[PDB]
Amino acid sequence: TLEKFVDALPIPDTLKPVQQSKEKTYYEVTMEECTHQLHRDLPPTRLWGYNGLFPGPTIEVKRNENVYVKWMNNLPSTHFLPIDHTIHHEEPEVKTVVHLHGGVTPDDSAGYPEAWFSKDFEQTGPYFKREVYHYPNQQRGAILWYHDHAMALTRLNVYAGLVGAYIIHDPKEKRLKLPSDEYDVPLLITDRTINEDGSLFYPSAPENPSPSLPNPSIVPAFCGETILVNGKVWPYLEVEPRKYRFRVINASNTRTYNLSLDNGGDFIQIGSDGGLLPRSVKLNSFSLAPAERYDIIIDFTAYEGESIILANSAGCGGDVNPETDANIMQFRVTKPLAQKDESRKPKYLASYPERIQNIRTLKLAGTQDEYGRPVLLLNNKRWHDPVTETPKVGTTEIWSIINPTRGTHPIHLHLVSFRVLDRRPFDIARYQESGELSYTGPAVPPPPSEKGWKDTIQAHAGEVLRIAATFGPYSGRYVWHCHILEHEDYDMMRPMDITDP
Ligand SMILES: [O-][O-]
Ligand SMILES: [Cu+2]
Ligand SMILES: [Cu+2]
Ligand SMILES: [Cu+2]
Ligand SMILES: [Cu+2]
């Protein structure tokens, strides 16, 4: 297999505005098919990249900065990854739309799966309204990320390389003196399988297919043989012996990580999806499902000279392999100090996170299609079925998510962030047989990591997860879905209409 830790970690350049004034910041980002080397020992790989880059450029904005991004499709008219036409029913083959994940945006700038467009906007989906997206950024400082969200193609377009980081900086947080600038580094983690000729591999069918099954066929999960951070296989990063802030983003299709440091040292978590936690949290390890973000500090001060592996204990389709997917990247504490470390790891970060208008019971279920494939469904509805999740703007609801399946689903709501209330185990067999919910244990409050603001949340097997969200500030057409892209595309995604009575 590919030799670990021979390439330096790329750090995406920060995007520069096409035009900027005190009143408006205007960016242009074009999707392009490009070639990039993923590892010292591979031929260059054909990829799709925002501005031809994988990951795309990091976008940095201030809270309340009035930002517009014209996302453009300049991609080939044919895909290079296997499209399954059976999963969705004259349209272009390559459809794209950019979703600012965690963004608080009007609905027509949110990247709705049916607001897609082909090259040069020649054809546009049924809910397309605009070319230039508006991001008012009137929301908490946080780590966001952007990625393709096109109907029935998300797993493919994201796997092709269409992901990037988007950081909101709230100037009110500057006084905390968290590690900043060169000492504040995003880590976009994406697992991939790569052929010997350097081409991306994505499966065209499940294992040992019926013959029979459409070809290509969607698969219900994807586990890559190799781990990349910031577009490089198993990279190293030379760090100074001092505190760093890392914006850890899981940009993988299916894979969940469980991260630790191989010297047994601690992370300090300072932030979750929705921004700074009320208090910093000392952690030895953490799980990180698709689309979750952990904003962390690692203090290398006492580790000068050392090589420390960011390790992973979570398997994907099997036990983790010590020589491969057990590794993420390697820190080498060998960079000389550019200056005194004047950063801080404060205990007190932010304030702690209303009438309950509605309690919504939701189940994670599904059925089998005519080919015998599993179709994952929220409340046994298709995407296309009339909308049922219709919160009223400005009101708070509790959503109670029942998971009687065998696996965890990272459930994501667009627009809002939410609080995690609790998780409670139930009798799966009794639920499947009668629809009756019978608890087998008391409710468990969230771990400290989940006591702030979240937008993507692990709903574990045989549990009811309860979250609470206030729906706003915008009314309109949004989405909620599982963020395992293989599940999202078939068909674990539903409209979420926030209404204005
Ligand atoms: O967010 O998909
Ligand atoms: Cu997302
Ligand atoms: Cu989202
Ligand atoms: Cu799922
Ligand atoms: Cu989404």
Curated annotation (Swiss-Prot):
The record marks 110, 488 as: Plays a crucial role in the protonation steps. Residues 44-80, 95-172, 234-312, 368-499 form the Plastocyanin-like domain. Changing residue 468 to F: Retains approximately 70% of the wild-type activity with both ABTS and SGZ. When expressed on the surface of E.coli cells, CotA was shown to possess improved enzymatic properties, including higher thermal stability and stronger inhibitor tolerance. It has high enzymatic activity against three industrial dye types: an anthraquinone dye, Acid Blue 62, a triphenylmethane dye, Malachite Green, and an azo dye, Methyl Orange. It may help decrease the costs and simplify wastewater treatment, and therefore, surface-displayed CotA shows a great potential for industrial-scale dye decolorization. CotA is also a promising candidate for the clinical determination of direct bilirubin and total bilirubin, which are significant diagnostic marker of liver function and cancer. Changing residue 483 to A: Does not affect copper content. Strong decrease in catalytic efficiency with both ABTS and SGZ. Cu cation 2 binds at residues 101, 147, 483. One of its GO terms (molecular function) is oxidoreductase activity. Changing residue 481 to C: Decreases copper content. Strong decrease in catalytic efficiency with both ABTS and SGZ. Disruption phenotype: Disruption of the gene does not prevent spore formation, but mutant is blocked in the appearance of the brown pigment characteristic of colonies of wild-type sporulating cells. Binds 4 copper ions per subunit. The 4 copper centers adopt structures classified as type 1, type 2 and type 3. Keywords: Copper, Metal-binding, Oxidoreductase, Repeat, Sporulation. Gene3D superfamilies: Cupredoxins - blue copper proteins. Induction: Expression is switched on about four to five hours after the onset of sporulation, a time that corresponds approximately to the stage of spore coat synthesis and deposition. Cu cation 1 binds at residues 99, 412. It comes from the Bacteria. Changing residue 483 to C: Decreases copper content. Strong decrease in catalytic efficiency with both ABTS and SGZ. Monomer. This is Laccase. It comes from Bacillus subtilis (strain 168).
